[PDB]
Amino acid sequence: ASVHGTTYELLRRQGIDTVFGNPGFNELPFLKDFPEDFRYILALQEACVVGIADGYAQASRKPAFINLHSAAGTGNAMGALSNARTSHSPLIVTAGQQTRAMIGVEAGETNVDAANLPRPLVKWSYEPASAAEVPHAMSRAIHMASMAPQGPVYLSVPYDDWDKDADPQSHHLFDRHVSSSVRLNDQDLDILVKALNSASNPAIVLGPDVDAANANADCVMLAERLKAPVWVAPSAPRCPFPTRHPCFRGLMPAGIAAISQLLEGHDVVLVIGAPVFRYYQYDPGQYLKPGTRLISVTCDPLEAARAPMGDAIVADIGAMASALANLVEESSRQLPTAAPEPAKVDQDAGRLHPETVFDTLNDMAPENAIYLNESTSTTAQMWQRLNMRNPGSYYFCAAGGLGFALPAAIGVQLAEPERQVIAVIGDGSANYSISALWTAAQYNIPTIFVIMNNGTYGMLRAFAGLLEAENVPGLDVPGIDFRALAKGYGVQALKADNLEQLKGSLQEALSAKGPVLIEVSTVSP
């Protein structure tokens, strides 16, 4: 009968059993009487709350539910919501509002013009006009988050609403099923399949929505049937393909001219689940060389509209990948040759080269490990050196916003308790969401954090070189003791100053029953 009771019934009926949150005054009437079939995951700062929720939703491929405090709690999470937008993460962000009777006077903790604060990062944002409509607004939020293209949504709820009577008609919300598992009509799909079958030198480019859809295995069958090389689209937030499969060609360069040069000679380039393209450095040139046609399958109208070249189909990635994989003819061409083994770099018995750490991780980690990357200057080496053969094995801040991997690795590990999660994070990136470590300690979530400590924002110094930007301040972060910080939050703390210490401490961390942070001294660039 109460809005509180009806809303938790709607959540449980829609598959939700976990609330990620940091509490406040406005949220106490929502969180009180907390149901025994739900669990509450506390984090100490809201960027950490949302990052944990985000990794959990991406790994579990289902929506995550979040409860923050009013404007200041929502505002603390806006960086994390920037990443969630670009990863298409289905996050239901709720926040408590002041009692309806004092919103106009703007009492303390009032979220002023609340629906505008999340924008423009969310796909829907709303504050209900009455308590009895809160379950309906929750239902809208749940489905807006889950419908393709998935993404974060925001709901602001005045705290006096929870005790009020819910609309009796709200029960019709509980079991609603909304599908967007759609694909191109048969006639046009046959034209596309005919164009793929008849390409003499096709190429495939895969983006994060493939891994989100668990379309990986169908994309493998597609690449094998067309005998086609496979790249992952630049600035990759996820891994959509086994990285040691013979077709895999790794991470594309993030420049306009670099990409059209690599494409040159491929007559049909099929892009699935990816923006066209997430360029980074400005590398002006031709978008495509003559003789290359590009076709993009995307779950997101905005991606289809913003591409500067190619044709596009707006459809569900799982349904389209499955349909294409089963319809294309087996080409008589020879399968592409696997990329060469990465080489061992020179390693003396002191500070570690990043290449060495990736090679050791690849040797020792389980074959179904899950990795997260926030070591920004070593991303290329990481993609070359980690054999990720299974789906959901890689996460990287989708919008480039640091502060994702440390909390996200906790959420992934929570969602996949049978797969060892290993977050490789630079010493600069580690600080943005450092307090997330406490959640791993308190809930005994056994994520492994590998801190790559070279004392500087290495990626920025390299980019500065690219931009001929000299005498830039703020690029060095000396004087951080990551073992002490780990201890501060109750997380076991190891160090690795050479290769033998690295091997030993990783093997310890694998066997450890709790979370473990390993501080690795890496070479300064």
What is the contact surface with ligand TPP in residues (CB under 6 A)? Answer: 79, 374-378, 400-403, 426-429, 432, 454, 456-460
Pair 372, 408: CB distance under 8 Å:
yes
Nearer residue to ligand TPP within complex by CB, 25 or 280: 280
Residue with the CB atom nearest Mg ion in the bound state: 426
Q: Does 354 bind Mg ion (CB under 5 A)?
A: no
| Secondary structure of residue 167 in the 3-state scheme | coil
Alpha-carbon distances, residue 74 vs 102, 144, 459, 461 (angstroms):
20, 19, 29, 32
Nearer residue to ligand TPP within complex by CB, 35 or 400: 400
Max CA separation in the chain (angstroms)? 74
CB of 455 to ligand TPP, least distance (A): 8
DSSP classification of residue 352: B
437 is in an annotated binding site: no
456 is in an annotated binding site: yes
Rounded to whole angstroms, the Cα distance separating 525 from 522 reads: 9
452 forms beta bridges with 426, 520
Q: Choose the one of ligand TPP, Mg ion, none that binds residue 110, judging by a C-beta under 5 to 8 angstroms depending on kind.
A: none
39 is in an annotated binding site: no
Cβ of 418: how many Cβ atoms within 10 Å? 6
Q: Does 373 bind Mg ion (CB under 5 A)?
A: no
CB of 108 to ligand TPP, least distance (A): 29
Q: Choose the one of Mg ion, ligand TPP, none that binds residue 336, judging by a C-beta under 5 to 8 angstroms depending on kind.
A: none
Helices assigned H by DSSP within 273-353: 301-306, 317-327
Nearer residue to ligand TPP within complex by CB, 156 or 429: 429
Helix (H) / strand (E) containing 364 = helix 354-364
Per CB under 5 A, the segment of 38-46, 156-164, 353-361, 448-456 that binds Mg ion is 448-456
CB of 388 to ligand TPP, least distance (A): 20
CB of 248 to ligand TPP, least distance (A): 24
Nearer residue to Mg ion within complex by CB, 269 or 452: 452
188 is in an annotated binding site: no
Determine the angle formed by the axes of helices 134-146 and 3-13, rounding to 10 degrees: 20
427 is in an annotated binding site: yes
Nearer residue to ligand TPP within complex by CB, 48 or 272: 48
With CA atoms as reference, report the closest residue to 512 among 429, 393, 413, 390. Answer: 413
Nearer residue to ligand TPP within complex by CB, 58 or 376: 376
214 is in an annotated binding site: no
3-state secondary structure 37-74: CCEEEECCCHHHHHHHHHHHHHHHCCCEEEEEEHHHHH
Q: Does 426 bind Mg ion (CB under 5 A)?
A: yes
Q: Does 429 bind Mg ion (CB under 5 A)?
A: no
With CA atoms as reference, report the closest residue to 391 among 416, 414, 360. Answer: 416
Applying CB under 5 A, among 127, 211, 427, 519 the residue interacting with Mg ion is 427
CB of 151 to Mg ion, least distance (A): 30
Nearer residue to Mg ion within complex by CB, 22 or 376: 376
CB of 372 to Mg ion, least distance (A): 16
Write each residue from 449 to 488 as x if it is in contact with Mg ion (CB under 5 A), else as -, in one continuous string.
-----x---x------------------------------
Q: Which long-range contacts (CB under 8 A, 24 or more apart) does 338-342 make?
A: 338/244, 338/245, 338/246, 338/248, 339/244, 339/248, 339/249, 339/250, 342/381, 342/384, 342/385
Residue with the CB atom nearest ligand TPP in the bound state: 426
Q: Choose the one of ligand TPP, Mg ion, none that binds residue 74, judging by a C-beta under 5 to 8 angstroms depending on kind.
A: none
CB of 204 to ligand TPP, least distance (A): 29
Single-letter residue type at 310: G
Nearer residue to ligand TPP within complex by CB, 376 or 393: 376
Strand order in the sheet with 153-158: 39-42, 18-21, 64-69, 91-97, 153-158, 125-126
Cβ of 23: how many Cβ atoms within 10 Å? 16
Rounded to whole angstroms, the Cα distance separating 433 from 430 reads: 7
516 forms beta bridges with 448, 492
For binding to Mg ion (CB under 5 A), which residues are involved? 426-428, 454, 458
Residues annotated within the binding site are: 116-117, 119, 427, 454, 456
Sequence ranges of the binding site for Ca(2+): 427, 454, 456
Binding site residues for Mg(2+), as ranges? 116-117, 119
